[PDB]
Amino acid sequence: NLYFQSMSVGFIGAGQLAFALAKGFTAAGVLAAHKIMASSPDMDLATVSALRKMGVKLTPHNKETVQHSDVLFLAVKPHIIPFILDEIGADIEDRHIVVSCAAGVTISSIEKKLSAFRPAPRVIRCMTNTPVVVREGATVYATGTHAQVEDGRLMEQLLSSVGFCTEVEEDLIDAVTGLSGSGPAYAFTALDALADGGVKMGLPRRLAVRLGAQALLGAAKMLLHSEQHPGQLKDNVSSPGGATIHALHVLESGGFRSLLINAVEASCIRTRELQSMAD
Amino acid sequence: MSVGFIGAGQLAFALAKGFTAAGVLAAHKIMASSPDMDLATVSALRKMGVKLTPHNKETVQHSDVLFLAVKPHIIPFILDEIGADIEDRHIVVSCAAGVTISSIEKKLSAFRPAPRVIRCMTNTPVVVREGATVYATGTHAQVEDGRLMEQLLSSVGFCTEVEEDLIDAVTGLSGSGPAYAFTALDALADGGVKMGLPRRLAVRLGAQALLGAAKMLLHSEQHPGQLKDNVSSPGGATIHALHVLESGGFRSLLINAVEASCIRTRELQSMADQE
Amino acid sequence: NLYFQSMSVGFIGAGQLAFALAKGFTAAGVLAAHKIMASSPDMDLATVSALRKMGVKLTPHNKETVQHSDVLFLAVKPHIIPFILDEIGADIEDRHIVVSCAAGVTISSIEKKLSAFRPAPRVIRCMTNTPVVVREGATVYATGTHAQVEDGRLMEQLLSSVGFCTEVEEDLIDAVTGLSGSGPAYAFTALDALADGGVKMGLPRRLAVRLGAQALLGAAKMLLHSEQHPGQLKDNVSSPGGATIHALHVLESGGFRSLLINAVEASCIRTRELQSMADQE
Amino acid sequence: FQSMSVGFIGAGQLAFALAKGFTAAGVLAAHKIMASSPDMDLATVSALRKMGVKLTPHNKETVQHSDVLFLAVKPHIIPFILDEIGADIEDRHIVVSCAAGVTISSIEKKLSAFRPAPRVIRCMTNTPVVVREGATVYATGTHAQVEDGRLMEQLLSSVGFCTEVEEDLIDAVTGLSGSGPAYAFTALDALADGGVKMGLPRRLAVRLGAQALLGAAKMLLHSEQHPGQLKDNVSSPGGATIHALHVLESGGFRSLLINAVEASCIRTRELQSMADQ
Amino acid sequence: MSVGFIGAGQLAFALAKGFTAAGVLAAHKIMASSPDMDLATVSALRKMGVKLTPHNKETVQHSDVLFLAVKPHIIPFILDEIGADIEDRHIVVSCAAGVTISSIEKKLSAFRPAPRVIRCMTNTPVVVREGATVYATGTHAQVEDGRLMEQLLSSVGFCTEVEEDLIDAVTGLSGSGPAYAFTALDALADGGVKMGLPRRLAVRLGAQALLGAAKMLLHSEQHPGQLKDNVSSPGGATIHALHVLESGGFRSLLINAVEASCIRTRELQSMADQE
Ligand SMILES: NC(=O)C1=CN([C@@H]2O[C@H](COP(=O)(O)OP(=O)(O)OC[C@H]3O[C@@H](n4cnc5c(N)ncnc54)[C@H](O)[C@@H]3O)[C@@H](O)[C@H]2O)C=CC1
Ligand SMILES: NC(=O)C1=CN([C@@H]2O[C@H](COP(=O)(O)OP(=O)(O)OC[C@H]3O[C@@H](n4cnc5c(N)ncnc54)[C@H](O)[C@@H]3O)[C@@H](O)[C@H]2O)C=CC1
Ligand SMILES: NC(=O)C1=CN([C@@H]2O[C@H](COP(=O)(O)OP(=O)(O)OC[C@H]3O[C@@H](n4cnc5c(N)ncnc54)[C@H](O)[C@@H]3O)[C@@H](O)[C@H]2O)C=CC1
Ligand SMILES: NC(=O)C1=CN([C@@H]2O[C@H](COP(=O)(O)OP(=O)(O)OC[C@H]3O[C@@H](n4cnc5c(N)ncnc54)[C@H](O)[C@@H]3O)[C@@H](O)[C@H]2O)C=CC1
Ligand SMILES: NC(=O)C1=CN([C@@H]2O[C@H](COP(=O)(O)OP(=O)(O)OC[C@H]3O[C@@H](n4cnc5c(N)ncnc54)[C@H](O)[C@@H]3O)[C@@H](O)[C@H]2O)C=CC1
C-alpha cells in the first residue's frame, strides 16, 4: 500500500467518531497510533483519554493538527465547521486533503470558506459510522471540485481498510446518513429490546444479548452474500403455522416496517436542516 | 466421522453447507434423506457432494451423528420408523423446534435403553458460518457427547450449552431472529429508497450497518444503550430518528415478537404432547 | 464550612423560586436570613408569609432590594423582567452581580437594558429548580460579557450549597430548562401515578406515596453514584421471567420513553418560543 | 449489631446489593457474611469476593455459618432450597426470604417438617440498598419473636426505609418499590435522550435528569403536600413546564405507570400460583 | 414502423417485451439507448433482439416513434441533447411521470416549430400485455397520431385518451397500483402461511384470487360493492374477514396511497418547473 507509506492523518475534534476511525485505522494496521493527531478544546473527555491510551498525539490547538497532517478529518459538530474553517483556513496548504465527516455540511460551503485563502482546496465529504472500530464500517464519500483522482483512490483504500466504502454523488449523502450513518443506533436499540424479550421469556440477560446480536450479525451477513431478495430469505425461515410467522405478524401489526422508514426519513431530513442551519 | 440428516430441506442445506465450508466435514461423509427427492434443497445438496437417498433407514445406517431436521410434527413418525435401527454408536441430535428430549427419549427407549439424545436450536445463518446455536444434553448423553456437539457446531457460529427449559425462549430470540432482521432490512432499504438511494446501494448499506453494529456489540464490554449514546450526537440526525422509533413503540414490537414466537413454540409442543 | 460573611443577597420577586433558594441557602448555613432581602408587589403572598418566618427582610420596593443587595436574583416571570430592568436599571452599581433565573431570558437582552444606564453590568444567567429547597437542586449558569472570573466562581460556590451546579454555554440553557428545570413536575406526575397504581393493587395511599418516592430517590442516587449506564442498572433489577420485566414491557407498549422525550422537547421549544416573542415585543 | 453472622443462599444481584449496603453502613463486617451459589463464575460472585464476603458452593455451609439467613434465589428455586437445607435450620436461625411472591406459609410448611417452630420473615427490598436508600417492607411469620421483627427492622433500616406490613401487601409493594428502580432507570434513560435531542451532551443530560428525579423525590418525602400541589408550584401559567405536562397527559403517561405497578404485582402473584400447584 | 427508446431500464424492457410478444413490433425494428450499457435491463433487451447503443442520437435517427423512458429529472437534459435531431416524422412519446406536455414542447420548439408530442402514463404489467395506459395528445399532434398511439398501446393492455390534467392522478392509481398489489400479495401469502399453507401454494392462490376478482369486475356491469355482497355469505367466513379489514381502516389506507402518489407526482414536477 504505497498510499499509506508515509501519510500522516489528523482529526479536528477528538470525540466519538475521531476515536472510532483512529481505533479502526490502527487495528487495520494501515497507520501507526503515533502518526495520528487529534484536537479538542476539552482534554478532559472520555474519548480524549482513550485516544491517549492508544498512543495518539493529542493537542488543544487545531493549528497543530493541520500542520502535522496530510489527510485532515473534520470530526466536530456541524455548526462548528465554519468556525473551524475560519480558524485553520489560512493554514490549509495545497498539500492537504480535507475530509469532512460532519453530518449535512456540503462540499460547497467548505470550499467557499477555504477557496478564499488558497484557490484549489482539496475537499472530500464523507459519511461513515462507528463500526469502523471493528473494521465493519459503512462509508460513502463524494469528491470535491479540486480533488485529484489519486485523492479519491487514496480515500477509497483508506476507508476500505475499516469496512465497506464506495464513491457516491454528494446529493445522496444525506440519505446515506439516515440509513447507515444512524443505522448502528437503530441496531443497538433493536438488540436491547430483543434482549428484553429474551429476558421476559426466561433467558439470562447476558445470553439474550449474545444470541440477539449473533442472530442479527448472521442475518446481515446472509443478505450480503445472497443474491436473493430480503423477503425470499424471510420466506425460507417462515415455516407454515410456525413460531416465526406468528412473530412476524405481531411486528406487522405494530407497523414495524414503517417505523424504520420513518427513522431513515427523520435522520435524512434532520441532516438537511443541519446544513441549511449553516447556509 | 459420519453425519446424517433426516429431512433434506432448508435447515439440512444450511448446516451441511456450513460444515463443509468450515472444513470440519467432507461432503461425501454426509448423507441426507427426504421423500420428495425433487425439492430444490435436495438439488442444492446434490450439487454440493452430499450423499442423498429417499430411505431414512440408509441415513441411520451410514451416520454416527444423526441430525433430525424435519418439521416438528414429523418427528414422532420418524422416531417410529428408525427407532429400531438406532445403535449404541449414534448420537441423535434433534433440531425440531419445541420437541422435548423427554418425548424423543420415550419413543426411542421402547427399542433400546439409554438412547444418546441432544436437543439443539440453531438458525439459518450457519450457512455463512455465523449461526447462533444452543443445545441441551439428554439423560444418557455421555460427557464427550456434549463436547463433540459443541465443537462441531462452534465451527458454524456461536454455540453454548443451556438447560433445556431455556430452549423455547431461545427459539423466539435467535431462532426466529433472522426473519426479524430480514424484515428490518427490507424496510430500512425502502426508507433509503424513499430518500433518494438506489435500491441496490440501500440494501448493501443497511445490511452492512446491521452487521457492523452487531459485531461492535459482540466485541465490546459495553451495554447496547451506551453504544447507542456514542452514535447519537447532541441535536443530531440519529437522536431525531431514535425519537420516531420510540414514538412508534419500536422496542415493544421486538419484545412482542420474541414472546409470540416463544409462546407459539410451547403451544405447538403442547398439541404434540396432548397426543 | 462555607460562609459569605461580606455578601448580602436580594430577590426581586418573592414567589416559589425565591422562597426555595432562600430556604435552601439558610438551611445550608451559607447565609443568615437577615442578610437576605426580598421584594414583591403582593406583600400578602403565602411565599412572602413563609419568608417572613425564616427572618428574611421583606419590602414592596424593588429599589430597596437593589440598594441592600450585592448579589441580586431576578426571580420574576420572564415577561416581568424588562419592566424590572427599566425600574432599577439606574440603581445598579459596579458592585452588583445580577443573577437572572427567568426561563428563556437571554444575557443579551438583560445586558442591553442595563447598559443604557451604566456600562458593563455584571450579569449571570441561571436555570435552577425547586428541589434547592431540600438542597438537592440542579443548577446551570452562564456568565455574561462583563462578569469577572470571581463572579462565576462565587455563584457556583453559592449555588453548589443547595445542590448540583455547573457552568454551561448559554445556548444550552433552554434545553436544561426542558430537562432539569421542568423535570421535578414530571417526577411529581410520575409519583402521583405510581401511587395510584399502588392503591389499585391494594396499598394504603400514604404507604404507596412513601414507597414510590423512596424508589425514585434511591434509583436516581444509584445512577448518580454509578459509572454504569442506566440500561445496565435496569438489567440488574429485571430478573429473567420476573415481575419487573413484565412491567417494563407494558411501559414499552405505551411508548413511555417517547413521552418523556416529547416532554423535554416541548418544554424547551416553549422556552425558545417565549423568548423569541419577547424579543419582537 | 454485635457480631452477627449473615448468610445469603444465592449470590446474585440482590445478595450483592444487600451485602454491599450492609458493609457500607458499617453494620456488618464483609467477612461475617457468607454467600453460596452453584456457579462461582458469576460477576456478582467476583464482586462479593473482592468485597471480602465468604463464598462457597455449598448451601449447608452458608446455613451453618449464619444467624440471619437470607434466601436470595429465584422464586421457583425456593422449594428446592428448603428441601435441601431444611434439616440444617436450627432454632437459633432467622430465615429471611427475599424471593418475590413466595409466601411465608409455603416456607413454614417446608421447614416445620424438620424443626417445629421455624422463625420466618418475608421481605421485599430493592437494589438501592446498595447506596443505603432502599425501600424495604417485611412481614413476620408464625414463630418469629417480637425481637425478630425489631432486629430485622434495625438491620434493614441501615440501608434505607424499612417498615412492617401485613403479608397480603407485599405483592403490591413488589410492583411499586420492588420494580420501581427499573421504571426510574427507563425514565432517566429517556429523559437524557430528550436532553440530547435538544442539544445537551449525554453525560450532562444524564447528570441533570438524575439530579432532577432525586431532588423531586426528596422534596415529596420532606413535604406534607400532595404531589399535584408540588407540580402546581413548578408550572407557571402559559409556561414551559405546563406545555410539557400536556404532552405527557396526551400520551396517557399516568396510566402507563399504573399499568406497570399492576403488571408487576399480577406477575408476582402468578409466580406464586405456579409454585403452589 | 420503427420505434426507439431513450432510457433502457425497467419501463423500456416492459414495453418492448410486450410489443414483441403482441406481434405489433419486431424486435429488430426497435432501438434502445442508455449510458451505463451494462445494466441488467440492457442485457434483457439484448437477448430479446432489440438493437442497442450508448448514443441517444442514433436512437432518434432510427425511429419514427420515440419513447422517452428516463427518470423524470433527466428529461430536460435529453430534450437538449436531441432536440436538434427531431424531424417532421417523429412522434415523441414521454413516459416520464409528472413531466408536462408544455415543458417538452417548450424545449423542443426552440429547435423546430410544432413538435408532435404525446404524454402517456403506463405501468409495468405491459410486460404480460395487461397494462393500464392513458395518454394526452399535445398541441401539434395530428389526428392520426392519437389513433396510432392508442392502437400500439392497446396491444399491451387497456388504453384510452385523457385530458392531460388527469394524468398525475392516474399515476397515483394505475401507475403505482402494481406496487400496492405486490405488497398486498406478499401479505396475503404471509397470512396463508400463518394459517398452515406452504408459501408457494399461498402465493399462487393469492395471486389467482386477485386476478380473478379483477377480471370479474372488469367484465361485469355491477358495482364492486355488489360483487363483494355475493361473496360474503350470511354469518360466514368472508364477512368476518371483511370486518377486520374495516376495523383497520383498510379502505382509507388505499385512498391515502393514491393521494400520496398523486401529490408526490405534482410536487416533483413543481420542483422541475421551478427551474
Ligand atoms: N458519532 C457518530 O456515530 C457519527 C458522527 N459523525 C459526525 O462527526 C461529528 C462529531 O460526531 P461526534 O464525534 O459524535 O461528536 P462528539 O461531540 O462526540 O465529538 C465532537 C468533539 O468536538 C470537540 N470540539 C468542540 N468544539 C471544538 C472546536 N471549536 N474545535 C475542535 N474540537 C471541538 C468537542 O469537545 C467534542 O468532543 C459530527 O459532525 C457528526 O455529524 C459522523 C458519522 C457518525
Ligand atoms: N428454517 C429455519 O429457519 C429453522 C428450522 N428449524 C427446524 O428444522 C426443521 C426443518 O426446518 P426446515 O428445514 O426449514 O423445514 P423444511 O420443510 O425445509 O425441511 C423439511 C424436510 O422434511 C422432509 N420430510 C417430510 N416428511 C419426511 C419424512 N417422513 N422422512 C424424511 N424427511 C421428511 C421434507 O421433504 C423436507 O425436505 C423443523 O423442525 C424446524 O423447526 C430450526 C431452526 C430454524
Ligand atoms: N418555579 C420553578 O419551578 C422555577 C422558576 N424559575 C423562574 O423563576 C421566575 C419565577 O419563578 P416562580 O417564583 O415560580 O414565579 P412565582 O410567580 O411563584 O413568583 C413570582 C413573583 O414575581 C413577583 N412579581 C411580579 N411583578 C413584580 C415586580 N414588578 N417586581 C417584583 N416582584 C414582582 C410576584 O409578586 C411573585 O412574588 C420565573 O421567571 C421562572 O421562569 C426557574 C426555574 C424553576
Ligand atoms: N434484583 C432485584 O432487583 C430484586 C430481586 N429480588 C428477589 O431476589 C431473588 C434473586 O434476585 P436476583 O439476585 O435478581 O437473582 P439473580 O439470578 O441475579 O441471582 C440468583 C442467584 O441464585 C443462584 N442460585 C441458583 N440456584 C441455586 C441453588 N440451588 N442454591 C443456591 N444458589 C442458587 C444463582 O446462581 C444466582 O447467584 C429473586 O427471588 C427476586 O425476586 C427481590 C427484590 C429486588
Ligand atoms: N418502473 C415503473 O413502474 C414505471 C416507470 N415510468 C417512468 O419511466 C421512466 C423510467 O422508468 P424506469 O425505467 O423504472 O427507470 P429505470 O431507472 O429503470 O430506467 C432509467 C434508465 O435511464 C437511463 N439513463 C439515465 N441517464 C440517461 C441519459 N442521459 N440518456 C439515456 N438514458 C439515460 C439509465 O441508464 C436507465 O437505464 C421514469 O420517468 C418513470 O417515471 C412510468 C410508469 C411506471
Curated annotation (Swiss-Prot), chains B, E:
It is linked to Cutis laxa, autosomal recessive, 2B: A disorder characterized by an excessive congenital skin wrinkling, a large fontanelle with delayed closure, a typical facial appearance with downslanting palpebral fissures, a general connective tissue weakness, and varying degrees of growth and developmental delay and neurological abnormalities. Patients do not manifest metabolic abnormalities. Changing T238A: Decreased pyrroline-5-carboxylate reductase activity. Keywords: Acetylation, Amino-acid biosynthesis, Disease variant, Mitochondrion, NADP, Oxidoreductase, Phosphoprotein, Proline biosynthesis, Stress response. Changing G248E: In ARCL3B; results in a reduction of protein expression in skin fibroblasts from the patient. This is Pyrroline-5-carboxylate reductase 1, mitochondrial. It comes from Homo sapiens (Human). It catalyses: L-proline + NADP(+) = (S)-1-pyrroline-5-carboxylate + NADPH + 2 H(+); L-proline + NAD(+) = (S)-1-pyrroline-5-carboxylate + NADH + 2 H(+). L-proline binds at E164, A237, T238. Pathway: Amino-acid biosynthesis; L-proline biosynthesis; L-proline from L-glutamate 5-semialdehyde: step 1/1. The lineage of its organism: Eukaryota, Metazoa, Chordata, Craniata, Vertebrata. Its EC number is 1.5.1.2. The gene is PYCR1.
Curated annotation (Swiss-Prot), chain D:
Its EC number is 1.5.1.2. Pfam families: F420_oxidored (PF03807), P5CR_dimer (PF14748). GO terms for biological process: cellular response to oxidative stress; L-proline biosynthetic process; negative regulation of oxidative stress-induced neuron intrinsic apoptotic signaling pathway; proline biosynthetic process; regulation of mitochondrial membrane potential. Keywords: Acetylation, Amino-acid biosynthesis, Disease variant, Mitochondrion, NADP, Oxidoreductase, Phosphoprotein, Proline biosynthesis, Stress response. NADP(+) binds at residues 9-14, 37, 59, 72-75, 98-100. Changing T241A: Decreased pyrroline-5-carboxylate reductase activity. L-proline binds at E167, A240, T241. It is an enzyme of class 1 (oxidoreductase). Subject to competitive inhibition by the reaction product proline. Subject to competitive inhibition by stearoyl coenzyme A. The keyword Magnesium does not apply. Pathway: Amino-acid biosynthesis; L-proline biosynthesis; L-proline from L-glutamate 5-semialdehyde: step 1/1. It is found in: Mitochondrion. NADPH binds at A11, Q13, L14, S37, D39, N59, V73, K74, A100, N233. The modification N-acetylserine is found at S5. Changing E224A: Reduced enzyme activity. GO terms for cellular component: mitochondrial matrix; mitochondrion. One of its GO terms (molecular function) is pyrroline-5-carboxylate reductase activity. The keyword Mitochondrion applies. It catalyses: L-proline + NADP(+) = (S)-1-pyrroline-5-carboxylate + NADPH + 2 H(+); L-proline + NAD(+) = (S)-1-pyrroline-5-carboxylate + NADH + 2 H(+). It is linked to Cutis laxa, autosomal recessive, 2B: A disorder characterized by an excessive congenital skin wrinkling, a large fontanelle with delayed closure, a typical facial appearance with downslanting palpebral fissures, a general connective tissue weakness, and varying degrees of growth and developmental delay and neurological abnormalities. Patients do not manifest metabolic abnormalities. Cutis laxa, autosomal recessive, 3B: A disorder characterized by an aged appearance with distinctive facial features, sparse hair, ophthalmologic abnormalities, intrauterine growth retardation, and cutis laxa. HAMAP family: P5C_reductase. Belongs to the pyrroline-5-carboxylate reductase family. Oxidoreductase that catalyzes the last step in proline biosynthesis, which corresponds to the reduction of pyrroline-5-carboxylate to L-proline using NAD(P)H. At physiologic concentrations, has higher specific activity in the presence of NADH. Involved in the cellular response to oxidative stress. Homodecamer; composed of 5 homodimers. Interacts with LTO1. PANTHER family: PYRROLINE-5-CARBOXYLATE REDUCTASE, PYRROLINE-5-CARBOXYLATE REDUCTASE 1, MITOCHONDRIAL. This is Pyrroline-5-carboxylate reductase 1, mitochondrial. The gene is PYCR1.
